[PDB]
Design a protein around this ligand. Structure first.
Ligand SMILES: CCCCCCCCCCCCCCCCCC(=O)OC[C@H](CO[C@@H]1O[C@H](CO[C@H]2O[C@H](CO)[C@H](O)[C@H](O)[C@H]2O)[C@H](O)[C@H](O)[C@H]1O)OC(=O)CCCCCCCCCCCCCCCCC
Ligand code: CLA
Ligand code: CLA
Ligand code: CLA
Ligand code: CLA
Ligand code: CLA
Ligand code: CLA
Ligand code: CLA
Ligand SMILES: CC1=C(/C=C/C(C)=C/C=C/C(C)=C/C=C/C=C(C)/C=C/C=C(C)/C=C/C2=C(C)CCCC2(C)C)C(C)(C)CCC1
Ligand SMILES: CC1=C(/C=C/C(C)=C/C=C/C(C)=C\C=C\C=C(C)\C=C\C=C(C)\C=C\C2=C(C)CCCC2(C)C)C(C)(C)CCC1
Ligand SMILES: CC1=C(C/C=C(\C)CCC[C@H](C)CCC[C@H](C)CCCC(C)C)C(=O)c2ccccc2C1=O
Lengths: 738, 39, 29, 80, 150, 61, 141, 150
């Protein structure tokens, strides 16, 4: 009987616990003796599982926490709109896209910062944005700032509502464990209402607002002169005139004469030649189909009527010879452990954000997106990152489940058991495959560097000398361009020009063109696949042995987060699952960093540039295929040559990127102090300094203590990532903008 | 509100209500007296 | 070309070959 | 193997025996302390040197000390 | 019935007997190979193993080498004859350290009866293998360039 | 021994509270060596607020 | 009082894991654990895996004494049982280990004289110039 | 002058650094109308930037062969460059430090002092804040009195 279950007024709402830091744990509530206290209370702030054993209280905490998050995000979205309304060039940008640089930030005039307000066009002085909002706005049919203001105020209200919601569903009406466990209902409602009705109603916006307004703009008519989007609704005469099938109304819909809607619901593909973005008509039909798919999909699982599948039944059904009892027991786990769910969800979200980057790379869905190289590089790099992080996080929490929630006695599961029983083979094989991959990828580059140094170019791995052709990839590319003829007849052009031909260009710039694949590409992909396999090695090893190993059989009792178990057994540094996540972050950074470098060099050399007399001049003149085969080529043709614009960014609008360039190196290097050292030194240092304080009667009551080993590692990895990422960030953006 | 004020007199809150003050002060003085290398 | 044709590959291989051989036997035995 | 010693500052709170993963220490009667008992290390050939014992000691300064010494197959935590 | 089971009855031994490891076949093929045979003297095993690698090393140094674009198979010939002679140093030096007093193997069979111990591991054992790896290797190398060349 | 609750300086050099002040909790009247049980306001590294000391390793000041 | 006899009794249910025995058990010293489990209830394999206990006498096979004292403390704390455990050698000999004198080491038992027990404060150690010209260390004086 | 370096009031390079910076902004200002918003900024910056150069020429700093004003850090042509500011710091730093001293000591005797490092007694601190105005007169008197050192 799936039903609404709630506790009434479980927690009073006075500031009695605000004024008591570390209320949430009996340990911290006692107060600080040492400075370590300060760290601990922030470390364990959101760690609800260690606070209480009650799954109810945890469950109430988690989403109210999520209502708070959503409030924050709305406020963030509110921000962008408002600035896009108040402090921007958008209207100027809604009249000559080609010759205005998108800007939605102004600096105040003090302290020389004025120079950051650069010559961005439309008679406006400011910071060029690379978020890609201006194109979203054109895609949504936004024409005037007023509209942006109104959207902003709405987001602020929504922020208020989400904050209210979060206080409410903890302090007045907190749902019961039973509630949260209605997985079938949750799944159905999220699939059908959220995604389904979401893309359906959106598709409503697209068919009634986006499509018409876009055609008039692409026609060239002044945006001020364009009819307002409500008058499109009440005067369909304008819609009839733009697409004829509106004359027949919703009659063709009910009568199944859908072919009459071929005016605005297309399958053409390729790019809109006047704008370098996907057809909005393709997108409208995309969302229409997707809405139906999700809507019917969201009616799979059993709720308050006999009809529908039960998750536990499907799970208990699915067993075979090699696995024994199979999926049995998994439902119960995945209805009692937030960690396990978090682990799943982070892996697939993360994977999703990376596929989003690519698919946005290959199929620019917004107007004048493709030709704003700054925006395109920013978005692909960004989304590639957040994915990166989320995937490592999936590994982290998987291990946390493995240590804190796994209990075979109470909640048995055999798939898991069988995995545990042969972990050694898995990890050893991953080890092997990784050494393989490392040698046969890096080794190729070292081989090339050596042959190139020894004067033997004919012996190199390159299109000229050695051929390592991506035959499969070329096949699939072959199949993709020929598909509109044979296997997808109703489709006019290809999904993407990076498979097909037809080089489409806007404003003298290349929007998209066929991407050639040679030996250099063979190289970098196998480097990737190496990096991913190593990251998986570290993280999987971390999760599978989180509980026990040959060295430390009782690791499970010691925790998820802990430094070591001493210098015994020869020495046991970095045994914990946390330490695996630790090292996993570095390799992830490594992998992701070569990807975006791959992306940037690839794009500037083989794709992007200007279009002259029946011909193309690329930004870096197709050096990739010949230069990216050696380490020296990256060192010189990518790093050294490209860093030019960042290193001389001084005295300009882009100088902030030079400052951040240096600052990010600083902070990166600064991490190494924490990573390379240990708190034994620091604590003795602190002993001497404390002496000095006491000598002058200026010693603190909160006894000054060096960071824990774990915190040293966390600070280390954090500053390492922030430094690295911020440096690449200042690099690309100054580079691609200039 | 004895409780609410103790929170406002917590370390991270005071620091922030102190730094926005001594930041403004230094931005302010750099406005009406711009670009100093003496005094 | 007389001397360095002999002394380079002997110092390159034949010195480390019997060094890695006779030092291995010193370690394990 | 590693050396493990117990000094006379021992209170005999027994945490160091109860903490050990390889059973090196034991409690013996004595005449020095309020608890009438003291810690002892008769099995140091099985000692790994992981220093849980030390971490467990309440005395100031610690009344167990582990001096990492000559290393044998057991002290190196080997199962292979 | 479970496809995968404990190791020869014992479930507390570090292994899992899959249809990959233990089966009607695999237990018959691996015993057919030179090294795993128990009853044979230590001379003939090393030749049957040693020869084989002389052909696995032979193909390689012909077509990928520096003189691949030309003495291409004379080049590839004695280079396969080399990893042979080094293995012989590796296997003679491997032997020099290990065996001081008597052999050391899992004495019994799967049936469990105390079968005679193999000379695979002994003082006079690895010598005739190290010899087999030489005479097999050096001669076995020659026949990948009497057939591809001569 | 010292009177209960008296402020006492530590003179054992290897202590975390060496040359520092503590209060006497109870001096055990027996044949024990370290009878003077002292408790301090500030903990050591090992999360301990209290220790045992001998009669020559305290000075009431 | 007498140390345990070393009989043949059946090990508890287990599909098998890779974490278990290796070459060390064959040519070095492996380890054996003994206890009387009341009912059939599941336990954590310290070398990885789920495994069901059987009623009556149960014995396990491990290659390190940590894998015993991780399990024993997991058998002693959770189920509240009491296991004995001892070594094995590859010629067929045994070394009785735990509990060595029937009593577990944490609570006091007569007839266990003190070993490696220094009878001074640690700072009353001599400086390591006064232990050169020897094979001695800093604590044993 | 001092270290042979020219005074900024006279020097050529310094006066040519004026020109270059101004004539960078006048190449921008062309691309906008005079009534416009950014033109009032590119005029105001110029006015400020041209005022700035004038106000070092009036200050009388030493400018080198570089064209940049260098500083003097010992004695009396250029007191105000370092010698005066220097005291400024040691005061306000001494202010901050001594307030912080008087806070920690003022708490010290109150059962649990650690609470006052976190939930800071604001109306204690804001009284010590003003008291810390006359700190060198107290700091000296405390060094005299002999309560300053442990
Ligand atoms: C030539 C190429 C290099 C070829 C071989 C060297 C590579 C391998 C070195 C790594 C091993 C380091 C090590 O064994 O690790 C551990 C060692 C030894 O540690 C010792 O470990 C000992 C082990 O004890 C055991 O052994 C003892 C007897 O040895 C006793 O038996 C004892 O009871 C028993 O417990 C003890 O515990 C000692 O207390 C402890 O000090 O550490 C140490 O002391 C290190 C040894 C001293 C090094 C001297 C300082 C070097 C500083 C160099 C700075 C950079 C210079 C670069 C210049 C570049 C210019 C271009
Ligand atoms: C996460 C969201 C976010 C972020 C990061 C920023 C960031 C910024 N805003 Mg803000 N802004 C936001 C949301 C956001 N805004 C929202 C929700 C509103 C109300 C709808 C505003 C309204 C606003 C105004 C009115 C101004 C700023 C300004 C600024 C800048 C100066 C900050 C300051 O005054 O000190 C800074 C870049 C100032 C600026 O650009 O100069 C400025 O004048 N913002
Ligand atoms: C049509 C109804 C509907 C819709 C549109 C949504 C939409 C949402 N739910 Mg869901 N939810 C629903 C029904 C629905 N829910 C039902 C019936 C249940 C089970 C009783 C849940 C239980 C649920 C939980 C437990 C959480 C959400 C959360 C969310 C948000 C996820 C983040 C996002 O996509 O933004 C989202 C707004 C998350 C949130 O509030 O943030 C969250 O933690 N939902
Ligand atoms: C929505 C996602 C999400 C959520 C809610 C959590 C929640 C949590 N994480 Mg986290 N984690 C995440 C993403 C997430 N993680 C990601 C993306 C990563 C990769 C960097 C990690 C990596 C990570 C580590 C390394 C650790 C946690 C830990 C924690 C806990 C303490 C956090 C705190 O209070 O500070 C808490 C249960 C800590 C724990 O012990 O649990 C811990 O050590 N997480
Ligand atoms: C250029 C520098 C460098 C080099 C040459 C290597 C080389 C290697 N690392 Mg890596 N590693 C590096 C930097 C480097 N590492 C750094 C800076 C860190 C600190 C985060 C690590 C942390 C690290 C881990 C944690 C692991 C590797 C692994 C490996 C091995 C991968 C298998 C292979 O290719 O063979 C290999 C020996 C993997 C392995 O063991 O295989 C593995 O799991 N490395
Ligand atoms: C806390 C430090 C601080 C200090 C010392 C000052 C001091 C001053 N501000 Mg204020 N100001 C501050 C913070 C501060 N401000 C902050 C936090 C903001 C927004 C984030 C502003 C925004 C602001 C504006 C918009 C204006 C002032 C103005 C002024 C001047 C008042 C002129 C008048 O009333 O006649 C004065 C010098 C006025 C001015 O300069 O004229 C004025 O209109 N201030
Ligand atoms: C896995 C990496 C890799 C790969 C696939 C190759 C592949 C090749 N190398 Mg090698 N080489 C490598 C790493 C690698 N190299 C490294 C790390 C070095 C040290 C710098 C060299 C140094 C080297 C030399 C000196 C020569 C080759 C040559 C060759 C060719 C013949 C080798 C043979 O048949 O055996 C072949 C195409 C030979 C050739 O003719 O080309 C040759 O003269 N290589
Ligand atoms: C009430 C605040 C206060 C006061 C008055 C002092 C006073 C002093 N500190 Mg400082 N110190 C403080 C807070 C304070 N400290 C805090 C919050 C930290 C942590 C960030 C430090 C960390 C610190 C270090 C690391 C050192 C000093 C040192 C000193 C002395 C020299 C001046 C200096 O370098 O600074 C001086 C007696 C130096 C010293 O002892 O000489 C020294 O090395 N302090
Ligand atoms: C961006 C943003 C925003 C905005 C938003 C918006 C503006 C939205 C809208 C939305 C909407 C406005 C939606 C709508 C929806 C709708 C729907 C969902 C409908 C449905 C329907 C149905 C389902 C039906 C069915 C039926 C019937 C009943 C009858 C006949 C038959 C049929 C079956 C057809 C805000 C400010 C918030 C914030 C910030 C961000
Ligand atoms: C003049 C000049 C100069 C020089 C200088 C010199 C040469 C100096 C020296 C100095 C010295 C030789 C010093 C000494 C000192 C000592 C001592 C001994 C100190 C002490 C201190 C203290 C004790 C402090 C305290 C406090 C206070 C007062 C407040 C705050 C808090 C505290 C606590 C920190 C130059 C050229 C550079 C520049 C120009 C000018
Ligand atoms: C330097 C260093 C330290 C010592 C560094 C410390 C303790 C960092 C923290 C210092 C900051 C400045 C303390 C925070 C102070 C508060 C923010 C309050 C300051 C008051 C106002 C100025 C805001 C370690 O603890 C450590 C541990 C493990 C490996 C490496 C290292 C390591 O390298």
């Amino acid at each position: 009987k799936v039903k609404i279950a709630v506790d009434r007024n479980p927690v009073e709402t006075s500031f009695e616990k605000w004024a008591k830091p570390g209320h949430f744990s009996r340990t911290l509530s006692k107060g600080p003796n040492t400075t370590t206290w300060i760290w601990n209370l922030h470390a364990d702030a959101h760690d609800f599982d260690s606070h209480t054993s009650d799954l109810e209280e945890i469950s109430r905490k988690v989403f109210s926490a999520h209502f708070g998050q959503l409030g924050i995000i709305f406020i963030w979205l509110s921000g962008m709109y408002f600035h896009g309304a108040r402090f921007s060039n958008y209207e100027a940008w809604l009249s000559d896209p080609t010759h205005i640089k998108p800007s939605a930030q102004v600096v105040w005039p003090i302290v020389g910062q004025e120079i950051l307000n650069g010559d961005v066009g439309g008679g406006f002085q400011g910071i060029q944005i690379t978020s890609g909002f201006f194109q979203l706005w054109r895609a949504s049919g936004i024409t005037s700032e007023l509209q942006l203001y109104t959207t902003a105020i709405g987001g602020l209200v929504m922020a208020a509502a989400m904050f209210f919601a979060g206080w409410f569903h903890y302090h007045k009406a907190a749902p019961k464990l039973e509630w949260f466990q209605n997985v079938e209902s949750m799944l159905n409602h999220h699939l059908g209402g959220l995604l389904g009705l979401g893309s359906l109603a959106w598709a409503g916006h697209q068919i009634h607002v986006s499509l018409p307004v876009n055609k008039l703009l692409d026609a060239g008519v002044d945006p001020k002169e364009i009819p307002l989007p409500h008058d499109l609704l009440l005067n369909r005469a304008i819609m009839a005139d733009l697409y004829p099938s509106f004359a027949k109304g919703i009659a063709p819909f009910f009568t199944l004469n859908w072919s009459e809607y071929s005016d605005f619901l297309t399958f053409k593909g390729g790019l809109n030649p006047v704008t370098g973005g996907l057809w909005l008509s393709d997108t409208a039909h995309h969302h229409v189909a997707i809405a139906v798919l999700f809507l019917v999909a969201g009616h799979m699982y059993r709720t308050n009527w006999g009809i529908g599948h039960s998750m536990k039944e499907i799970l208990e059904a699915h067993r075979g010879p090699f696995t024994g009892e199979g999926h049995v027991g998994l439902y119960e786990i995945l209805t009692t452990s937030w960690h396990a769910q978090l682990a799943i969800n982070l892996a697939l979200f993360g994977s999703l954000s990376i596929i989003v980057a690519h698919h946005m790379y290959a199929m620019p869905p917004y107007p004048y997106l493709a030709t704003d190289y700054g925006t395109q590089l920013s978005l692909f790099t960004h989304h590639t990152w957040i994915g990166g992080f989320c995937i490592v996080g999936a590994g982290a929490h998987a291990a946390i489940f493995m240590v804190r929630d796994y209990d075979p006695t109470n909640n048995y599961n055999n798939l898991l058991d069988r995995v545990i029983r042969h972990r050694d083979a898995i990890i050893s094989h991953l080890n092997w495959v990784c050494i393989f991959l490392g040698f046969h990828s890096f080794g190729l580059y070292i081989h090339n560097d050596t042959m190139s140094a020894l004067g033997r170019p004919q012996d190199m791995f390159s299109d000229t000398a050695i051929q390592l052709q991506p035959v499969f990839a070329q096949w699939i590319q072959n199949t993709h361009f020929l598909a509109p003829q044979l296997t997808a007849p109703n489709a006019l052009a290809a999904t993407s020009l990076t498979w097909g031909g037809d080089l489409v260009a806007v404003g003298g710039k290349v929007a998209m063109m066929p991407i050639s694949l040679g030996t250099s590409d063979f190289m970098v992909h196998h480097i990737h696949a190496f990096t991913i396999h190593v990251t998986v090695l570290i993280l999987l090893k971390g999760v599978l042995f989180a509980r026990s190993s040959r060295l430390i059989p009782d690791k499970a009792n010691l925790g998820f987060r802990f430094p070591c178990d001493g210098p015994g057994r020869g020495g046991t540094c970095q045994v914990s699952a946390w330490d695996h996540v630790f090292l996993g972050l570095f390799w992830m950074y490594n992998s992701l960093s070569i990807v975006i470098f791959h992306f940037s060099w690839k794009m500037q050399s083989d794709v992007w540039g200007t279009v002259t007399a029946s011909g193309v001049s690329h930004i870096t003149g197709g050096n990739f295929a010949q230069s990216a085969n050696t380490i020296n080529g990256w060192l010189r043709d990518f790093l050294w040559a490209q860093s030019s614009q960042v290193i001389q960014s001084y005295g300009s609008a882009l100088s902030a990127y030079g400052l951040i360039f240096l600052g990010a190196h600083f902070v990166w290097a600064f991490s190494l102090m924490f990573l390379f050292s240990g708190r034994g030194y620091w604590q003795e240092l602190i002993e001497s300094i404390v002496w000095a304080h006491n000598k002058l009667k200026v010693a603190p009551a909160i006894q000054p203590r060096a960071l824990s080993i774990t915190q040293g590692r966390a600070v280390g990895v954090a500053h390492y990532l922030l430094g690295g990422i911020a440096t690449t960030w200042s690099f690309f953006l100054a580079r691609i903008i200039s | 509100m004895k409780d609410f004020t103790t929170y406002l007199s917590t370390a991270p809150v005071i620091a922030t209500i102190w730094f926005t003050f001594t930041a403004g002060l230094l931005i302010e003085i750099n406005r009406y007296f711009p670009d100093p290398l003496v005094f | 070309s007389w001397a360095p044709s002999v002394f380079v590959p002997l110092t390159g291989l034949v010195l480390p070959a019997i060094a890695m051989a006779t030092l291995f036997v010193y370690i394990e035995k | 193997a590693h050396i493990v010693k117990i000094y006379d500052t021992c209170i005999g709170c027994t945490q160091c025996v109860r903490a050990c993963p390889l059973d090196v220490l034991e409690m013996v009667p004595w005449d020095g302390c309020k608890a009438s008992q003291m810690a002892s290390a008769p099995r140091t050939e099985d000692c790994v040197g992981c220093k849980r014992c030390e971490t467990a000691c309440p005395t100031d300064f610690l009344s167990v000390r582990v001096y990492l010494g000559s290393e044998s197959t057991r002290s190196m935590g080997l199962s292979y | 019935a479970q496809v995968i089971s404990p190791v020869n009855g014992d479930p507390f031994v570090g292994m899992l007997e899959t249809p990959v490891t233990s089966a009607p076949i695999v237990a018959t093929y691996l015993s057919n190979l030179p090294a795993y045979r128990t009853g044979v003297a230590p001379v003939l095993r090393g030749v049957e193993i040693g020869l084989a690698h002389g052909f696995l090393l032979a193909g390689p140094f012909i077509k990928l080498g520096p003189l691949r674009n030309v003495t291409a198979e004379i080049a590839g010939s004695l280079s396969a004859a080399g990893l042979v002679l080094i293995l012989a140093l590796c296997l003679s030096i491997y032997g020099s350290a290990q065996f001081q007093s008597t052999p050391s193997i899992g004495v019994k069979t799967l049936s469990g009866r105390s079968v005679a111990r193999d000379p695979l591991f002994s003082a006079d054992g690895w010598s005739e293998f190290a010899a087999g790896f030489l005479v097999g290797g050096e001669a076995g190398v020659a026949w990948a360039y009497v057939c591809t060349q001569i | 021994g010292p009177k209960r609750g008296s402020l006492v300086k530590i003179l054992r050099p290897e202590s975390y509270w060496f040359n520092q002040v503590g209060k006497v909790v109870s001096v055990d009247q027996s044949g024990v060596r370290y009878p003077v049980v002292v408790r301090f306001e500030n903990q050591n590294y090992a999360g301990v607020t209290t220790n045992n000391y001998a009669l020559d390793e305290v000075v009431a000041a | 009082t007498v140390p345990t006899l070393n009989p043949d009794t059946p090990s508890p249910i287990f599909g098998g894991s890779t974490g278990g025995l290796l070459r060390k058990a064959q040519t070095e010293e492996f380890y054996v654990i003994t206890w009387e489990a009341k009912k059939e209830q599941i336990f954590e394999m310290p070398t990885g895996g789920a495994a069901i206990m059987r009623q009556g006498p149960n014995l396990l096979k491990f290659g390190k004494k940590e894998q015993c004292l991780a399990l024993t403390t997991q058998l002693r704390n959770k189920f509240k049982l009491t296991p004995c455990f001892y070594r094995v050698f590859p010629d067929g000999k045994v070394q009785y280990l735990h509990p060595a004198d029937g009593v577990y080491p944490e609570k006091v038992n007569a007839g266990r004289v003190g070993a490696n027990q220094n009878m001074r404060r640690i700072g009353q150690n001599v400086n390591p110039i006064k232990v050169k010209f020897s094979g001695r260390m800093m604590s044993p004086a | 002058d001092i270290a042979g370096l020219t005074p900024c009031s006279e020097s050529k390079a310094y006066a040519k650094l004026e020109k270059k910076e101004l004539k960078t902004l006048e190449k921008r200002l062309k691309q906008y109308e005079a009534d416009s918003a950014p033109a009032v900024a590119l005029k105001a910056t110029m006015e400020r930037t041209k005022a700035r150069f004038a106000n070092y020429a009036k200050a009388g700093l030493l400018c080198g062969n570089d064209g940049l004003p260098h500083l003097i850090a010992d004695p009396y042509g250029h007191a105000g460059e370092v010698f005066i500011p220097t005291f400024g710091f040691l005061y306000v730093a001494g202010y901050i430090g001594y307030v912080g001293r008087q806070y920690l000591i003022a708490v010290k005797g109150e059962a649990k002092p650690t609470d006052k490092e976190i939930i800071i007694d604001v109306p204690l601190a804001t009284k010590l804040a003003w008291q810390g105005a006359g700190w060198p007169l107290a700091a000296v008197q405390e060094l005299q009195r002999g309560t300053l050192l442990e």
